[PDB]
Curated annotation (Swiss-Prot):
Disease cited in the entry: Cornelia de Lange syndrome 6: A form of Cornelia de Lange syndrome, a clinically heterogeneous developmental disorder associated with malformations affecting multiple systems. It is characterized by facial dysmorphisms, abnormal hands and feet, growth delay, cognitive retardation, hirsutism, gastroesophageal dysfunction and cardiac, ophthalmologic and genitourinary anomalies. CDLS6 inheritance is autosomal dominant. A chromosomal aberration involving BRD4 is found in a rare, aggressive, and lethal carcinoma arising in midline organs of young people. Translocation t(15;19)(q14;p13) with NUTM1 which produces a BRD4-NUTM1 fusion protein.
Family statement: Belongs to the BET family.
Description of post-translational modifications: Phosphorylation by CK2 disrupt the intramolecular binding between the bromo domain 2 and the NPS region and promotes binding between the NPS and the BID regions, leading to activate the protein and promote binding to acetylated histones. In absence of phosphorylation, BRD4 does not localize to p53/TP53 target gene promoters, phosphorylation promoting recruitment to p53/TP53 target promoters.
Organism name: Homo sapiens (Human)
Protein name: Bromodomain-containing protein 4
Protein's cellular compartments: Nucleus; Chromosome
Tissue-level expression: Ubiquitously expressed.
Tree of life domain: Eukaryota
Site positions for Acetylated histone binding: N99
Full protein segment contained here: 42 to 168 of 1362
Function: Chromatin reader protein that recognizes and binds acetylated histones and plays a key role in transmission of epigenetic memory across cell divisions and transcription regulation. Remains associated with acetylated chromatin throughout the entire cell cycle and provides epigenetic memory for postmitotic G1 gene transcription by preserving acetylated chromatin status and maintaining high-order chromatin structure. During interphase, plays a key role in regulating the transcription of signal-inducible genes by associating with the P-TEFb complex and recruiting it to promoters.
Comment field on protein domains: The NET domain mediates interaction with a number of chromatin proteins involved in transcription regulation (NSD3, JMJD6, CHD4, GLTSCR1 and ATAD5). The C-terminal (CTD) region mediates interaction and recruitment of CDK9 and CCNT1 subunits of the P-TEFb complex. It is also required for maintenance of higher-order chromatin structure.
UniProt cross-link Glycyl lysine isopeptide (Lys-Gly) (interchain with G-Cter in SUMO2), position: K58
Domain Bromo: 17-123
Subunit text: Interacts with p53/TP53; the interaction is direct. Interacts (via CTD region) with CDK9 and CCNT1, acting as an associated component of P-TEFb complex. Interacts with RELA (when acetylated at 'Lys-310'). Interacts (via NET domain) with NSD3, CHD4, BICRA and ATAD5. The interaction with BICRA bridges BRD4 to the GBAF complex. Interacts (via NET domain) with JMJD6 (via JmjC and N-terminal domains); the interaction is stronger in presence of ssRNA and recruits JMJD6 on distal enhancers. Interacts with NSD3. Interacts with NIPBL.
Length: 127
């Protein structure tokens, strides 16, 4: 029932780059999903205490959330776009694993994922 330390949002020894694709991921993809009406449950790490989900971190061992992704993008944490896309995919996957199909949180994840994929379809070529 207690929360782990959140995922790191910086790591000085980790390698990183600024790419036009990562800029797009912050300016377009994250920004669009962040403002969505269903973004709120995904804007911070799952709080197992507040939300009374005492089993959450007994099941989900690779937690991820858009608050973490936002800070990673702001902090130039990533080496490439794929590392960031992976984080979004971990967040969605965790939600589908932990919750029941048709639960409100799943409908929210599914709407955010639809939008995510629409935005990723226009990801520019690396230039
Ligand atoms: C519709 C959201 N309801 S709630 O905030 O009680 C909630 C209910 C369930 C969860 C979460 C939030 C967050 N989340 C990422 C998750 O997988 N489960
Ligand atoms: K499930």
């Amino acid at each position: 029932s207690m929360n782990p330390p959140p995922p790191e949002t910086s790591n000085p020894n980790k390698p990183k780059r600024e790419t036009n694709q990562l800029q797009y991921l912050l300016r377009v993809v994250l920004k669009t999903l962040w403002k969505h009406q269903f973004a709120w449950p995904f804007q911070q790490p799952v709080d197992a205490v507040k939300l009374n989900l005492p089993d959450y971190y007994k099941i989900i061992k690779t937690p991820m959330d858009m608050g973490t992704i936002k800070k990673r993008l702001e902090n130039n944490y990533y080496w490439n776009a794929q590392e960031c896309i992976q984080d979004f995919n971990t967040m969605f996957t965790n939600c589908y694993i932990y919750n029941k199909p048709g639960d409100d949180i799943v409908l929210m994840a599914e709407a955010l994922e639809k939008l995510f994929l629409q935005k990723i379809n226009e990801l520019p070529t690396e230039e």
